[PDB]
Amino acid sequence: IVGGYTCGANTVPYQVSLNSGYHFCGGSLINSQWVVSAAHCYKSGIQVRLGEDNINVVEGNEQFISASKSIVHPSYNSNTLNNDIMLIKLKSAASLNSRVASISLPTSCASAGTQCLISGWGNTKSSGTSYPDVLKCLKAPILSDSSCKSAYPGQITSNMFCAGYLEGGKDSCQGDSGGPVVCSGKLQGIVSWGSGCAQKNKPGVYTKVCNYVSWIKQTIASN
């Protein structure tokens, strides 16, 4: 996260880190046994790390649980990033409390201008790289679909939205992929792609979670 702030320990209790011997993506806990992340984050050997703040120090609220199932949307296109969503089933249920908690799925899509919270352990620099120890946060608005399309001609599908800034300096970046965009207490977005990070006129692009609620519920029910 570029241009953001230190969240504070366990203030984003649905935020998870996906770990394969290193942090490589974020995700969002949606019930005690399931996480939502980006399809582009798929790999074998995922360990889900819940209750993290400092991802480099064991502090006491961590739960480390192996993925049992990692389910990429059947229509994910890796060239366009359409349908950039994956469901991860945990091998055992997480213990839910104030510091490890699920986030609600949307009952409707969010409107342009709605302020959202974007979080992750990604890069905090727009030029070069620096990776934080602790979780970072950014408040960012949903942009109009026309502004999104003007920014990214020919590239924005009905399953994507833009959030953030056009003036530069505030965005999700390397290591934030798969993580949450939460608006009014609902998971509306997944960190998906952009042209660089925090560049002028190039806002972040996010998977539009409200389109997938029925798919998520059916997938969980059947697995």
């Binding site: 490589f24 993506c25 582009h40 890796s78 590239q155 290591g175 042209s195 990070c197």
Partner: peptide, 12 residues
């Protein structure tokens, strides 16, 4: 470039 914020990035 057009890239994902994964480690490593996926760019296009």
């Amino acid at each position: 470039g057009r890239c994902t914020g994964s480690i490593p990035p996926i760019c296009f």
